Amino acid sequence: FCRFTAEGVQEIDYKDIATLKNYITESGKIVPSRITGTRAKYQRQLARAIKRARYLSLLPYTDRH
Amino acid sequence: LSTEATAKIVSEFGRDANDTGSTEVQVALLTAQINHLQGHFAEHKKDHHSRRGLLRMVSQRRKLLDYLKRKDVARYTQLIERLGLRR
Amino acid sequence: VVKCKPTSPGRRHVVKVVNPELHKGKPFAPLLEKNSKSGGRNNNGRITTRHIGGGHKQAYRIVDFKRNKDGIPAVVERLEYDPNRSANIALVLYKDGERRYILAPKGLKAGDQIQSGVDAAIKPGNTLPMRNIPVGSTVHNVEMKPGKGGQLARSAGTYVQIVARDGAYVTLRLRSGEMRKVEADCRATLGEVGNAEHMLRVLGKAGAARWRGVRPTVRGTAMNPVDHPHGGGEGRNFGKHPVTPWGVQTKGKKTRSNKRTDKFIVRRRS
Amino acid sequence: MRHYEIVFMVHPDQSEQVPGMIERYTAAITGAEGKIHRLEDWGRRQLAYPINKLHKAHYVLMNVEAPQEVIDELETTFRFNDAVIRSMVMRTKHAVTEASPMVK
Amino acid sequence: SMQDPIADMLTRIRNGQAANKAAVTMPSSKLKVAIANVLKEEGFIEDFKVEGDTKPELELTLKYFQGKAVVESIQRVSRPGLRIYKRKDELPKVMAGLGIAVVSTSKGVMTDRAARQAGLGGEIICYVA
Amino acid sequence: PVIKVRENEPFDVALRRFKRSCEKAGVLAEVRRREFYEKPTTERKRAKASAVKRHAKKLARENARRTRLY
RNA sequence: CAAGCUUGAGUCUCGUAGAGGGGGGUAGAAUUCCAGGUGUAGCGGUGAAAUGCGUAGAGAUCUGGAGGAAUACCGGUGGCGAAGGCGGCCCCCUGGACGAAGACUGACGCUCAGGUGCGAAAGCGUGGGGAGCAAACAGGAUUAGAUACCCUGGUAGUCCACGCCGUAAACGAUGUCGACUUGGAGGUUGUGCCCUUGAGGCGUGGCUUCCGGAGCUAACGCGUUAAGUCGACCGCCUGGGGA
Ligand SMILES: [Mg+2]
Ligand SMILES: [Mg+2]
Ligand SMILES: [Mg+2]
Ligand SMILES: [Mg+2]
Ligand SMILES: [Mg+2]
Ligand SMILES: [Mg+2]
Ligand SMILES: [Mg+2]
Ligand SMILES: [Mg+2]
Ligand SMILES: [Mg+2]
Ligand SMILES: [Mg+2]
Ligand SMILES: [Mg+2]
Ligand SMILES: [Mg+2]
Ligand SMILES: [Mg+2]
Ligand SMILES: [Mg+2]
Ligand SMILES: [Mg+2]
Ligand SMILES: [Mg+2]
Ligand SMILES: [Mg+2]
Ligand SMILES: [Mg+2]
Ligand SMILES: [Mg+2]
Numbered sequence: 008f009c010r011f012t013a014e015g016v017q018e019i020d021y022k023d024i025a026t027l028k029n030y031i032t033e034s035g036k037i038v039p040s041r042i043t044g045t046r047a048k049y050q051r052q053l054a055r056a057i058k059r060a061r062y063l064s065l066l067p068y069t070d071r072h
Numbered sequence: 073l074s075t076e077a078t079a080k081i082v083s084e085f086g087r088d089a090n091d092t093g094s095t096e097v098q099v100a101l102l103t104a105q106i107n108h109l110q111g112h113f114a115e116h117k118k119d120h121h122s123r124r125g126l127l128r129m130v131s132q133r134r135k136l137l138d139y140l141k142r143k144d145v146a147r148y149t150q151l152i153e154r155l156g157l158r159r
Numbered sequence: 160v161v162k163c164k165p166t167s168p169g170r171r172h173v174v175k176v177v178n179p180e181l182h183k184g185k186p187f188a189p190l191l192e193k194n195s196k197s198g199g200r201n202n203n204g205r206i207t208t209r210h211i212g213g214g215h216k217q218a219y220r221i222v223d224f225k226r227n228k229d230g231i232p233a234v235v236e237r238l239e240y241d242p243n244r245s246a247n248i249a250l251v252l253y254k255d256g257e258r259r260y261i262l263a264p265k266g267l268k269a270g271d272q273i274q275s276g277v278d279a280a281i282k283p284g285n286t287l288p289m290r291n292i293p294v295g296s297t298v299h300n301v302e303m304k305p306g307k308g309g310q311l312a313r314s315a316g317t318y319v320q321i322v323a324r325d326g327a328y329v330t331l332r333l334r335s336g337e338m339r340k341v342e343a344d345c346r347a348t349l350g351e352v353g354n355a356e357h358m359l360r361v362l363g364k365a366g367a368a369r370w371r372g373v374r375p376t377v378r379g380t381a382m383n384p385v386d387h388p389h390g391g392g393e394g395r396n397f398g399k400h401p402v403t404p405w406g407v408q409t410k411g412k413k414t415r416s417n418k419r420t421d422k423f424i425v426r427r428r429s
Numbered sequence: 430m431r432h433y434e435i436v437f438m439v440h441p442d443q444s445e446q447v448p449g450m451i452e453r454y455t456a457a458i459t460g461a462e463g464k465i466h467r468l469e470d471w472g473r474r475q476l477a478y479p480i481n482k483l484h485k486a487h488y489v490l491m492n493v494e495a496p497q498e499v500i501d502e503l504e505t506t507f508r509f510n511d512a513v514i515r516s517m518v519m520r521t522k523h524a525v526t527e528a529s530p531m532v533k
Numbered sequence: 534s535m536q537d538p539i540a541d542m543l544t545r546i547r548n549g550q551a552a553n554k555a556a557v558t559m560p561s562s563k564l565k566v567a568i569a570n571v572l573k574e575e576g577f578i579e580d581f582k583v584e585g586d587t588k589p590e591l592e593l594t595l596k597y598f599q600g601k602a603v604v605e606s607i608q609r610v611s612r613p614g615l616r617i618y619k620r621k622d623e624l625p626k627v628m629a630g631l632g633i634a635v636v637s638t639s640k641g642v643m644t645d646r647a648a649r650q651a652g653l654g655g656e657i658i659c660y661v662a
Numbered sequence: 663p664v665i666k667v668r669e670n671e672p673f674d675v676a677l678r679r680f681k682r683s684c685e686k687a688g689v690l691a692e693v694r695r696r697e698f699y700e701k702p703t704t705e706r707k708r709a710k711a712s713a714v715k716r717h718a719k720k721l722a723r724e725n726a727r728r729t730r731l732y
Numbered sequence: 733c734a735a736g737c738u739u740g741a742g743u744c745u746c747g748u749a750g751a752g753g754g755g756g757g758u759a760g761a762a763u764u765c766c767a768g769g770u771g772u773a774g775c776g777g778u779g780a781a782a783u784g785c786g787u788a789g790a791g792a793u794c795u796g797g798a799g800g801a802a803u804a805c806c807g808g809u810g811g812c813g814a815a816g817g818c819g820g821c822c823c824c825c826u827g828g829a830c831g832a833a834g835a836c837u838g839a840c841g842c843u844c845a846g847g848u849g850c851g852a853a854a855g856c857g858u859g860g861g862g863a864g865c866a867a868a869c870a871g872g873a874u875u876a877g878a879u880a881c882c883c884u885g886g887u888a889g890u891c892c893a894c895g896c897c898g899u900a901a902a903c904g905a906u907g908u909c910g911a912c913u914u915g916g917a918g919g920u921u922g923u924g925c926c927c928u929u930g931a932g933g934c935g936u937g938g939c940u941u942c943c944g945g946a947g948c949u950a951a952c953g954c955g956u957u958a959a960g961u962c963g964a965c966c967g968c969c970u971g972g973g974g975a
């Protein structure tokens with residue numbers, strides 16, 4: 008019941024945050040693929056367009072800061 | 073090796089400007105790769121997992137020249153005297 | 160940087176340090192003067208620091224530990240074997256004919272265009288004072304009072320690393336592992352010093368001492384007891400705590416009392 | 430002529446030097462015959478962690494095509510300059526010219 | 534890669550024979566037609582074809598009696614590593630008289646029960662039991 | 663988990679939502695995992711024989727629901 | 733020997749996915765240590781204990797700082813490499829594999845004794861670094877003794893640039909290349925279609941995991957990725973000890 012393959016995207020640009028504020032949990036970790044149901048090609052592009060934003064200071068690393 | 077740097081060797085050595093499959097073309101397209109790749113192994117001498125491609129290219133060019141040496145000995149001497157290959 | 164081949168006892172252990180970048184010729188003429196071998200004896204004509212005397216004729220080469228000329232660029236010309244210090248010395252031609260000697264950084268050759276002064280761009284070879292250098296970049300020729308001359312970090316292969324730029328002071332870390340405060344406007348030079356493998360050189364034999372001007376050294380428990388505390392014994396005996404010639408302990412006892420400089424020593428070398 | 434997606438973060442006290450930075454970093458590319466595709470300011474943005482002990486920084490996105498030399502220069506200005514706090518330069522394989530997702 | 538086509542033909546026969554197929558194929562040749570021109574005339578296979586103008590596919594057709602298989606055992610006796618050349622003084626009979634051995638004489642490929650009375654010997658291409 | 667209580671939330675409720683919101687993010691598995699050292703051989707053996715026994719008890723559902731007993 | 737063709741083997745066009753190798757940066761959480769501030773009697777430890785650390789102020793708790801090693805979530809019998817093996821992000825140089833439509837060259841192929849390369853950890857040399865762990869070693873215990881598993885500390889070593897060593901259950905305990913022979917569940921990754929018209933149905937390619945039939949095997953088990961039916965070539969064993 009995926010989202011990316013459904014909507015027909017080809018790249019997950021990290022510079023959108025209104026999407027990635029669904030695919031991170033409360034603490035700031037990444038919710039696994041057998042829970043969001045994302046296909047396992049776009050899960051890798053998700054796990055890199057989160058780790059770019061965590062560097063570029065749009066998404067936290069933990070809950071505290 | 074870039075596209076317009078192989079489409080120069082195809083036109084230099086290729087008898088149709090389309091053929092891309094001749095034996096002299098398939099030796100020149102490896103020698104103008106090895107002699108360009110020698111200036112990458114002068115900086116990174118520990119790169120064995122991309123030295124295996126170089127040993128592959130060398131020992132396949134040796135086979136594609138020893139085919140030519142017994143097929144047509146006329147072409148083989150002028151091919152090595154054009155490329156500089158000693159043997 | 161090769162071992163010499165064992166033809167005969169005397170070259171069995173030699174590791175040279177050879178370098179083909181150097182100048183195989185004569186030094187620059189208006190930069191020499193006389194540095195005669197003082198022989199370890201002062202005006203009173205007595206041996207004060209021992210072991211010294213002998214060797215080869217060491218003609219001094221003048222060298223610019225100040226680098227005062229701001230603004231003007233400076234091409235390098237060649238390198239030479241200055242036999243005073245254990246570094247190598249570059250010969251520099253400025254844009255208006257003035258030649259000088261400077262210390263040689265690690266990435267130096269014939270073709271570099273260095274530039275001294277306040278507004279120098281950041282590249283190894285350049286110099287600029289330490290309120291425009293960025294933090295972390297390792298420097299040599301660090302001065303302790305602004306304008307005196309290059310004093311800190313001036314050997315064969317040393318460096319000091321700027322770690323903090325607070326107030327109107329900077330904090331270094333010297334090569335002997337001791338932190339140090341320096342006035343924030345002393346004239347430092349970026350990058351290390353070139354000839355980094357002098358410590359690999361094993362000299363090989365006795366003769367490479369007395370071609371460098373070091374005499375023999377007689378250890379303490381050889382002598383008879385009017386010349387050193389360690390003497391005596393009808394055979395071998397060393398039944399006393401290890402001392403200098405002149406009474407003082409040597410195996411650990413600290414001897415620093417220069418109490419006018421302790422504003423700047425942040426932590427001792429451990 | 431490989432394209433590039435650069436982004437840098439300047440300090441909000443020095444937030445009045447960004448037209449200087451934009452019209453001085455168009456120089457080293459467009460005078461270096463690399464075309465300039467899209468170029469946006471993002472204003473001041475709340476961070477979500479401390480970086481150099483502050484909380485609001487200033488983002489500029491610059492998506493530009495260049496020869497491989499001048500971009501290999503353009504990181505040194507960001508490093509030895511201390512106006513900018515962070516900079517990321519990615520190698521986009523093609524030439525994007527859409528509006529940024531956070532212009533809305 | 535391929536270092537023999539005859540022990541490719543025979544093993545396609547036997548592996549389409551014990552797997553209860555009906556029509557094995559292969560790429561053709563000029564020896565694997567003079568072998569399935571002996572197997573048919575003996576009677577081990579019903580009828581063969583050949584299809585194509587530039588690269589031909591030989592299409593055999595296997596046979597069955599009572600639901601079981603016809604070519605029960607089929608060895609291969611002169612193989613490319615080791616060539617067996619026998620003279621007609623010492624030609625072998627396979628299974629005492631019921632199984633043939635496709636001998637290549639000089640007078641065309643023929644079974645040994647005819648190529649012992651045509652008065653010559655030759656290579657022994659395959660036993661068939 | 664940072665459980666900020668709401669307006670008039672009773673205390674066992676605003677404590678049990680914390681204990682659930684800590685069990686979910688799972689810090690009591692992680693700080694048990696980093697307690698000792700599991701080598702790259704022992705961890706791989708464990709996370710292979712902890713997948714073959716997810717396979718077998720994903721499967722054996724749909725075979726042992728074919729043979730009745732009464 | 734001589735002459736040819738396109739299915740073996742190869743090159744060119746456009747792309748796709750990947751912890752493949754080598755070099756230089758940088759980001760965050762934590763362990764330790766140093767300087768302090770608040771603070772008062774215990775902390776640490778095991779099955780219970782003591783050794784050790786604290787009334788010279790530990791342990792907690794807050795700000796600040798130096799440095800080193802490793803990359804939580806993603807992370808899955810998932811991916812890449814010929815094996816050894818390889819996990820944060822970013823940039824340079826570079827090796828393969830695979831699909832797609834074509835054009836081309838005309839067996840250029842397969843295996844390989846002696847050779848020559850790569851080859852985890854441990855070791856070894858010369859020069860740097862050392863936060864965590866940690867053989868030897870020192871102390872407290874359990875014990876009939878305990879040179880041991882448990883505990884408090886801790887040096888080689890782990891790490892980095894360059895040289896040797898060339899061994900492991902280097903394991904799929906299965907040498908490499910090719911052709912055939914019933915099926916079904918998946919996973920990962922390309923692509924031409926058909927009302928694609930949100931997760932649809934019709935296909936053909938490569939790579940990897942379980943269960944299972946003929947046939948084989950002493951059995952267990954293997955099972956189109958064979959240990960089935962074959963062809964080419966190389967390695968290797970011949971009772972246990974001695975070894
Ligand atoms: Mg002396
Ligand atoms: Mg001595
Ligand atoms: Mg002596
Ligand atoms: Mg005496
Ligand atoms: Mg005395
Ligand atoms: Mg005596
Ligand atoms: Mg005595
Ligand atoms: Mg053709
Ligand atoms: Mg052709
Ligand atoms: Mg051998
Ligand atoms: Mg090692
Ligand atoms: Mg070592
Ligand atoms: Mg060491
Ligand atoms: Mg330590
Ligand atoms: Mg212990
Ligand atoms: Mg040792
Ligand atoms: Mg062995
Ligand atoms: Mg292994
Ligand atoms: Mg294994």
Ligand SMILES: [Mg+2]
Nearest residue numbers: 901902903905
């Ligand atoms: Mg073995």
Ligand SMILES: [Mg+2]
Nearest residue numbers: 948949959960
């Ligand atoms: Mg057998």
Ligand SMILES: [Mg+2]
Nearest residue numbers: 943944954955
């Ligand atoms: Mg099976």
Ligand SMILES: [Mg+2]
Nearest residue numbers: 958959960962
């Ligand atoms: Mg087999």
Ligand SMILES: [Mg+2]
Nearest residue numbers: 948949954959
């Ligand atoms: Mg067997």
